A paper describes a structure:
The apo structures of BACCAC_02680, BACCAC_02680E143Q, BACCAC_03717 and Amuc_0724 were obtained to 2.0, 2.1, 2.1 and 2.7 Å, respectively. BF4060 and BACCAC_02680 display 79% identity and unsurprisingly the structures of these two enzymes are almost identical in the cleft region. Firstly, in the −1 subsites of the structures from Bacteroides spp., the closed space around the O4 hydroxyl explains why only Gal configured sugars can be recognised as the equatorial O4 of glucose would not be accommodated. For example, BACCAC_02680 residues W131 and W138 are platforms for the −1 and −2 sugars, respectively. BF4060 (and also its close homologue BACCAC_02680) has a significant preference for TriLacNAc over milk oligosaccharides and analysis of the +1 subsite shows a narrow slot where a GlcNAc would insert with the N-acetyl pointing away from the cleft and S174 from Finger 5 would pincer the N-acetyl against finger 6, thus generating specificity for GlcNAc over glucose. BF4060, BACCAC_02680 and BACCAC_03717 also displayed some very weak activity against laminarin.
Residue numbers in the entry: 34 to 274
Amino acid sequence: NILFVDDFDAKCIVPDTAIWKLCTYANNAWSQYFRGVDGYENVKVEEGYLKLRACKDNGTYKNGGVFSKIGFPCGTRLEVKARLTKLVRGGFPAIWQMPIGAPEWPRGGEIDLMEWVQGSPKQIFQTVHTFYINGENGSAGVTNKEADKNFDVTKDHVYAVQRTEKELIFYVDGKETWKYENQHLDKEKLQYPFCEYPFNIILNFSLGGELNGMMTWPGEIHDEDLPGEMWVDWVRVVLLD
Ligand SMILES: [Ca+2]
């Protein structure tokens, strides 16, 4: 039972303009290099892929990224098939979900299906953020510490999360990796916001380096590794029985 699918196979050179919006600048690790990105110069649909490019164009770092204007209810599973063309040191690709119409981050939560950093290059990270975990200042969230440490992100993999009232279940390649569970605390504690808001889909290949002279988690950008691309074959949202 398919609620939403984009196979990026439309007769169009950009992703569906009603569904997908270009990521915009903000002063954070994932967003800083959307600044001065001219329209779709780092985003295209080609040969059945959404291709998100990270590059340096005349000394300016530029990220490739879109987010969905639509969001999805609980009782659903998101599956995203993607690969990186190349390992890029300082590269910071991600597949993730934000609440639509939540209060300020992280009070509505955040679900990361995939993040990659050079600091652990044979891994991907799957992570959850809430106000209960992060409070006002925290950014680490709760990550799968037992994540696969012999993993090649440059091959096609299906990254997935199943979201119910009870829990988030993470998968890689159809194999359960971990669960983040509803603790059923007073809603006041903001421990499990994941079913109060529709959640969207965010697909990006960002660049790290320093943010206001502090080294970001993805670490030092090696310009010799650029350009790089994340190729998304498809995204789908399945409605559970
Ligand atoms: Ca496709």
